[PDB]
Amino acid sequence: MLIRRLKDARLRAGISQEKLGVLAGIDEASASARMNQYEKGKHAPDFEMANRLAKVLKIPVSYLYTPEDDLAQIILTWNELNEQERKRINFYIRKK
Amino acid sequence: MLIRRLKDARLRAGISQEKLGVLAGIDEASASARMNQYEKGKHAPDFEMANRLAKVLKIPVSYLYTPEDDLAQIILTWNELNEQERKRINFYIRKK
């Protein structure tokens, strides 16, 4: 997991390390210590935990794994496009 | 990691489970057994291993973590766009 992606997305959500961890199913007593390990890159969550984090954060989960800043922006923005404008840009890309 | 993403990308590369594992730094004696665990979803690699896999497979690493088929296609295709056509579609998206 890339730590900047997790931290940026948490701060956009307006929630603390603890609340993110508790909503993602970490025991309350461990939640802030565990989230801080993740956010400092001390160790990384399993994919199942990342999905729970992404659902709390309302982002596509692969945003957390995208090292390319410009691709990460596409992911984050796509997340808020309608079905017409998704399929729109889909075929901008499907020609390449 | 999503197993379909890893398998699709390996088969596009034209290489076996063993060769993928060996190039990604797994010991030769374990390489095919380990890769098959990953591809069957029996357990999942750490992010550092996923990055080594992605570099062998010549894909952006977050392709392996993207459950949305249409977003995964954007990732895969972006991977083969030039700097002008990357920045092109960048601003198709930056207006949203």
Author numbering:
A (entry chain A), B (entry chain A): 1 to 96
Show the paper's wording.
Controller proteins play a key role in the temporal regulation of gene expression in bacterial restriction–modification (R–M) systems and are important mediators of horizontal gene transfer. They form the basis of a highly cooperative, concentration-dependent genetic switch involved in both activation and repression of R–M genes. Here we present biophysical, biochemical, and high-resolution structural analysis of a novel class of controller proteins, exemplified by C.Csp231I. In contrast to all previously solved C-protein structures, each protein subunit has two extra helices at the C-terminus, which play a large part in maintaining the dimer interface.
The protein crystallised in two space groups: a monoclinic form (P21) and a cubic form (F4132). The calculated Matthews coefficients were 2.38 Å3 Da− 1 (one monomer in the asymmetric unit) and 2.01 Å3 Da− 1 (two monomers in the asymmetric unit) for the cubic and monoclinic structures, respectively. Thus, there is a crystallographic dyad between the two subunits in the cubic form, whereas the subunits are related by a noncrystallographic dyad in the monoclinic form. The following analysis is based on the cubic form of C.Csp231I. The total dimer interface area of C.Csp231I is 1410 Å2 compared to 1040 Å2 in C.Esp1396I and 710 Å2 in C.AhdI. This is achieved by the interleaving of the final two helices from each monomer. In fact, the five-helix bundle that makes up the main conserved domain only creates 310 Å2 of buried surface area on its own. Surprisingly, this domain contains the only pair of interchain H-bonds (Ser62-Thr66); in contrast, C.AhdI and C.Esp1396I contain a total of four and five interchain H-bonds, respectively. The analysis of B-factors in the cubic crystal form of C.Csp231I reveals that the extended C-terminal region of the protein, comprising helices 6 and 7, is significantly more mobile than the rest of the structure.
